Write a protein that binds this ligand. Structure first.
Ligand SMILES: O=C(CN1C[C@H](NC(=O)c2ccc(Cl)s2)C[C@H]1CO)Nc1ccc(-n2ccccc2=O)cc1F
Ligand SMILES: [Ca+2]
Ligand SMILES: [Cl-]
Ligand code: NA
Lengths: 234, 43
């Protein structure tokens, strides 16, 4: 996360962290339930073997609440391809159930039609992760969050070197130096409605981080609510 | 549904995500456990 600030205790409880066999984070995820993590399909291409850490807020200190989970099944969208980054979604079933606690709790899945009309029309959403704090720099040892405005699809298309599909939406800032960055992908984009946070996106890609005239691109979760449903039930 | 039908969550007929029940009033949503989805956690 470039800009923004550190998540306070309990503030970003749906954050998950995919960790490689070096025990280093390389992607985020969203807790959907005691057994399921939502992440980006492109994240599955990095570590051949990875685990999931929940409850972590500082990767340099072991603090109460941290737990590690092995992944039992990876459900990657059949249509994802790096040619387009379209359908950049996967679900992970964990071998053992997450115990919800301080800093560990799922984000709500909205109902599709209501999400489209009510959440996707909100001014902002919140993105979080442990990724780089500057485009060329180091990953953050602390969990960060960032409020990101929804960006008009056409303004986004005009700004983008690549095709923005119906399974994507754009969020962030034209020139202000705040955005998600390398290491944050796979992680949550959630939208608060009244008193509840609903998962609306998956951090997916960007041309750099926080570049002038470029936005953050997210998988549009509303497009995949039935898919997520089926994936969690199989 | 265009003040959200006065609903706390989904929308006139209100409803709520998994781990919640619609309150008697029929607009608010009540968590059934200590860690309902989409709520920041309290110590
Ligand atoms: O490959 C990178 C490399 N990026 C990713 C980091 N940025 C981010 O992860 C994000 C910024 C904002 C968000 Cl949201 S995610 C910064 C460099 C580090 O090398 N970015 C891209 C750019 C473009 C694409 N892409 C888009 C559509 C079709 C093909 C295609 O390749 C993917 C991608 F990962
Ligand atoms: Ca830690
Ligand atoms: Cl790039
Ligand atoms: Na920008």
């Amino acid at each position: 996360i470039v800009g923004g600030q550190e998540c306070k205790d309990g503030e970003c409880p749906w954050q998950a962290l995919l960790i490689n066999e070096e025990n280093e984070g390389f992607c985020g995820g969203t807790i959907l339930s005691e057994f399921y993590i939502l992440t980006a399909a492109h994240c599955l291409y990095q570590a051949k073997r990875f685990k999931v850490r929940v409850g972590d807020r500082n990767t340099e200190q072991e603090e109460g609440g941290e737990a590690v989970h092995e992944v039992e099944v990876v459900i990657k969208h059949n249509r994802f391809t790096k040619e387009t980054y379209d359908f950049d979604i996967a679900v992970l079933r964990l071998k053992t159930p997450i115990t919800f606690r301080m800093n560990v709790a799922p984000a709500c899945l909205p109902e599709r039609d209501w999400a489209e009309s009510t959440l996707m029309t909100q001014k902002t959403g919140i993105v979080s992760g442990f990724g780089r704090t500057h485009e060329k720099g180091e990953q953050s040892t602390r969990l960060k969050m960032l409020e990101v405005p929804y960006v008009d699809r056409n303004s986004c298309k005009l700004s983008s070197s690549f095709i923005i599909t119906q399974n994507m939406f754009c969020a962030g800032y034209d020139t202000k130096q705040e955005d998600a960055c390398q290491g944050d992908s796979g992680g949550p984009h959630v939208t608060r409605f009244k008193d509840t946070y609903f998962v609306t996106g998956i951090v997916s890609w960007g041309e750099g981080c926080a570049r002038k005239g470029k936005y953050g691109i997210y998988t549009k979760v509303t497009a995949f609510l039935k898919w997520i449903d089926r994936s969690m039930k199989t | 549904c265009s003040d959200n039908g006065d609903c706390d969550q989904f929308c006139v007929v209100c409803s709520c995500a998994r781990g919640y029940t619609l309150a008697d009033n029929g607009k608010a949503c009540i968590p059934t456990g200590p860690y309902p989805c989409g709520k920041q956690t309290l110590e």
